[PDB]
With several copies, the nearest count.
Chain A
Amino acid sequence: MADQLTEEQIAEFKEAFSLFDKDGDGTITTKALGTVMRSLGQNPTEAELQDMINEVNGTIDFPAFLTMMARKMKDTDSEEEIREAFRVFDKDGNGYISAAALRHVMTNLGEKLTDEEVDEMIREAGQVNYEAFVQMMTA
C-alpha cells in the first residue's frame, strides 16, 4: 500500500517532492528526486536509484515518488515483522519457548488457528528456539 509510511513521514516526503518539483507541475526529474531523497536522509546508491526508478519526459511525479518509496517502506515493515518474530521468544528472556509457551503464544495470536493448526505449525518447525520460531514464521 502507498500509505505504509506514517503521517509525519508522508508529510515529509510530500514536502521534499514539492521542494524538488518547484515548478508546480508535480513532475520531478530523477536528479531532483535523488537530491530530495538525499536531503531527507534517504540517500540511495546509483544502482538503487535506477532500480527504484525502474520499479516505479524523464521526470517522476510526486505520486510516483510515493509509490517508489512504498517499496522501501514495505521492506522496512517486513524487516520489523521478522525482528518481532525472532524476538517473540526472547521477550520472556529465556530465548527458547517451550511447547506450552508456544501453544500459549499461538492461542494469544488468534489468527484463526486451532489445535490441529498449532500442531501442524509445531511439526513443520520440545522447546522452540527463537531462531527456529523466526524461521517457521518466515516459511
Chain B
Amino acid sequence: LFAGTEHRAIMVDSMLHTVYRLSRGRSLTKAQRDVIEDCLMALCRYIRPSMLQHLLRRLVFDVPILNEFAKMPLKLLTNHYERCWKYYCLPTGWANFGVTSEEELHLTRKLFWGIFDSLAHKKYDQELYRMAMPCLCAIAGALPPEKLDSFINKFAEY
C-alpha cells in the first residue's frame, strides 16, 4: 500500500530514515532487530528509490565503514538494486520513473568503491563472502598579518 508514495514523499522518507536509525540502536533484542531489518527491507523494496533518497544517502554515507548490524545495509542495497536495476544502471532509466539523480549516482558509486575496497582489504570470511560479495557483484553489475587583520575587520564590518 505504501509502495510508490509521492504525496507524502518527505514524510515517508523521514520515517524510513528514522526506522533505519532505530535498527542500528544498541538497545534491542535479536528478534526485534530481525523484525526491524525485515520491515526496513520490505519498505525499501516497495518504496521507490527516489522517495528514499534521504534514507539512501544516510545508508551509503558509511556503509563500508559500519560493521555492526552489517546485514541490513547489504540487504537494503541488494533489494534496491534488484528492484530498480535499470533506474540507475541504464542511462534512460525506468519506462515510468526514468533516470536517477547525478548526486545519487555519484554517492552510490562512492559507496560501491568503498565497499569493494574494504572487501579486497578485509580477510576472507564465510559470512563476508555470503553477504558483502553478492552486494559487490550487484553493484558492479549496476555499472554500465596586519593586512590580514585589517581584512578580517573589514569582513566583520561587511
Which residues of A come within 8 Å of B, CB atoms?
A: 47-48, 51
Which chain A positions have C-beta within 8 A of B29?
47-48, 51
Which chain A positions have C-beta within 8 A of B27?
47
Query: In terms of DSSP, what is the predominant structure of the interface of chain B?
Result: loop
Whether, in the assembled complex, B65 has its beta carbon less than 8 Å from a beta carbon of chain A, the answer is no
Which chain A positions have C-beta within 8 A of B30?
47-48
Which chain B positions have C-beta within 8 A of A51?
29
Q: Which residue of B lies closest to A50 (CB)?
A: B29
- 0/1 interface trace, chain B 3-37, chain A, CB 8 Å (1 if under): 00000000000000000000000011110000000
Which chain A positions have C-beta within 8 A of B28?
47
Q: Which residue of A lies closest to B33 (CB)?
A: A47
7 residue pairs A–B, Cβ–Cβ below 8 Å: A47-B27, A47-B28, A47-B29, A47-B30, A48-B29, A48-B30, A51-B29
Q: Which residue of A lies closest to B30 (CB)?
A: A48
Give the distance to chain B from A73, nearest Cβ to Cβ, in Å: 17
- 0/1 interface trace, chain B 29-54, chain A, CB 8 Å (1 if under): 11000000000000000000000000
Give the distance to chain B from A43, nearest Cβ to Cβ, in Å: 15
Give the distance to chain B from A126, nearest Cβ to Cβ, in Å: 27
Give the distance to chain A from B25, nearest Cβ to Cβ, in Å: 11
Give the distance to chain B from A68, nearest Cβ to Cβ, in Å: 15
Which chain B positions have C-beta within 8 A of A48?
29-30
Q: Which residue of A lies closest to B27 (CB)?
A: A47
Which chain B positions have C-beta within 8 A of A47?
27-30
List B98-142 residues whose CB lies under 8 Å from chain A: none
Give the distance to chain A from B27, nearest Cβ to Cβ, in Å: 7
Give the distance to chain A from B35, nearest Cβ to Cβ, in Å: 13
Give the distance to chain B from A78, nearest Cβ to Cβ, in Å: 13
